[PDB]
Each structure stands twice: as structure tokens, then as C-alpha cells.
């Protein structure tokens, strides 16, 4: 019934608060100055970048791209911790869990990245940096076209004014996608996603009673996500070829290969 679906939205929301340190809540506080706490160090150019190293953790584009690698890796670890709390996920065939995560974590990275973005830039190092969108375009090809698709998604996506408790179910719906290439056993995956989709719809009716067909609007964006992902994998294919001083992190390499 409706009761069991609110319980599921609650379990998911709690796991999400526990698994993800910088939530959309904090991120909007920071981005609005409404935190009334220490503003982030703004990185708008080459000099601001190198002055910034104190609040952050050989070529600039190559250094930016490879620093995002450590962030991606800690994201994959947070998202993997999170998936394990999705009821019935860990009881799946371990080979299915790996496949769902492999195809899922980048779609969730771009989903949650949008929480940290406005039209002008994106929070970095857990909200204590803010790197400008223009500075990121300012990078040298093929690095100047890396974050611009994500800024483009984030501005349309942030329109739906979702909050952490909507995103917690939405994330879980993305992971439990029964149509991932290579799934040994689709049905029990689709059983869980059916429940999650029902929980998401309830949550969206309750938390946004004025907002209408937010549920429908949000399922079409799960498509926008897959293309920002395939576009992303190609741009890596290119720079893995054109730039071979660069090291791809082992974990990132496990994911993107056979994708």
C-alpha cells in the first residue's frame, strides 16, 4: 500500500544522507550565500587555480581532468555504498550488481553533480571550492568540451526543483535499470524498480502536490542522462588516444571498458 512506499522513500532518504556527504541541501545553501558560513574559494582562471591548491585536494587541463578522477572514484564508492542499502539489491546475482553499477554510477554522478551546479559554475571539494563554467570551457581541446554537456543537463534538470528525498528514490530507480547490457536475470531487478518507481511517484505527488506530471517529466530525463553518458565515454575514448601521458584510475578503467 501507500504506507510501505513511504517507508521505502524514508529508508532510501536515510541511506542517501548517510552515503553522500554534500547533499543538494548544503549545496544550495552554499551556492546562495545563505549558508552564512565561509564562502568557497572561486577558481575562474589559471592564477586563481594555483592559489586555490590550499583549499583543494603537469599541464592544467591534464591536472584538472585527473583531479576529477579522484572525485569520480570517491563518488563511485559512495554510490556503491548507497546501492547496497537499496532493499533487495545485494540479494541479486553479484554479476548483476556489478553490471547495474557499471552502467549506473555515471548517470548518478551527472544527476548529483547537477545539485552542485548553477549556470555560472560548480562546487568542488565538498562545497569549499567553486570552479566557473567559463574557466572550464576556457580549457584546451579536447578538455574544453568535457563539463559543458553536464552544465547543459544540470540547468534543465535543476528546473524540476527536486530535493534530496526525491533524488534518493530517483537515484535508486536509475541503478535498478533492467535493460542494462549483460544482465543475467532481469526479472528480480525489474521487480525492485517497479516498487521504486511506485515509491518515486508517491513521493513526487506528496512533496510537490502543486507540481503535476513531475514524475513523467523526471522519467524522460533518465534518457537525457544516457546520452550525456555515451557522449562522455566517447570523449574519454578520444583523449585516451590523443593524450597518453594521462593515467586512467584503475576503478574508472574497470567501469568504462566493455561499455
Amino acid at each position: 500500500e501507500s504506507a510501505d512506499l513511504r517507508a521505502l522513500a524514508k529508508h532510501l532518504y536515510d541511506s542517501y544522507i548517510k552515503s553522500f556527504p554534500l547533499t543538494k541541501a548544503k549545496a544550495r545553501a552554499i551556492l546562495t550565500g545563505k549558508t552564512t558560513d565561509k564562502s568557497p574559494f572561486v577558481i575562474y582562471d589559471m592564477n586563481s587555480l594555483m592559489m586555490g591548491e590550499d583549499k583543494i585536494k603537469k599541464e592544467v587541463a591534464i591536472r584538472i581532468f585527473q583531479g576529477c578522477q579522484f572525485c569520480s572514484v570517491e563518488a563511485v564508492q559512495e554510490i556503491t555504498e548507497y546501492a547496497k542499502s537499496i532493499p533487495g539489491f545485494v540479494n541479486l546475482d553479484l554479476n548483476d550488481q556489478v553490471t547495474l553499477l557499471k552502467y549506473g554510477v555515471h548517470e548518478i554522478i551527472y544527476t548529483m553533480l547537477a545539485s552542485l551546479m548553477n549556470k555560472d559554475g560548480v562546487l568542488i571539494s565538498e562545497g569549499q571550492g567553486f570552479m566557473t563554467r567559463e574557466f572550464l570551457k576556457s580549457l584546451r581541446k579536447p578538455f574544453g568540451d568535457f563539463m559543458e554537456p553536464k552544465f547543459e543537463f544540470a540547468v534543465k534538470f535543476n528546473a524540476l526543483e527536486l530535493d534530496d528525498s526525491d533524488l534518493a528514490i530517483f537515484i535508486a530507480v536509475i541503478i535498478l535499470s533492467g535493460d542494462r547490457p549483460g544482465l543475467l536475470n532481469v526479472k528480480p531487478i525489474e521487480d525492485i524498480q517497479d516498487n521504486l518507481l511506485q515509491a518515486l511517484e508517491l513521493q513526487l505527488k506528496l512533496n510537490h502536490p502543486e507540481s503535476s506530471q513531475l514524475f513523467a517529466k523526471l522519467l524522460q530525463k533518465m534518457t537525457d542522462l544516457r546520452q550525456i553518458v555515451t557522449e562522455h565515454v566517447q570523449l574519454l575514448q578520444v583523449i585516451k588516444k590523443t593524450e597518453t601521458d594521462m593515467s586512467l584510475h584503475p576503478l574508472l578503467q574497470e567501469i568504462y571498458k566493455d561499455l
Binding site: 563511485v76 556503491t80 547496497k84 553479484l94 556489478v98 553499477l101 557499471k102 584503475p250 576503478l251
Partner: peptide, 11 residues
């Protein structure tokens, strides 16, 4: 095959 993922999962 996916030894870091297998390991993050089964951790």
C-alpha cells in the same frame, strides 16, 4: 574482471 567493484560490493 571487476575486482575493485566485486570488492567494493562484497567488502
Amino acid at each position: 574482471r571487476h575486482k575493485i567493484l566485486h570488492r567494493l560490493l562484497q567488502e
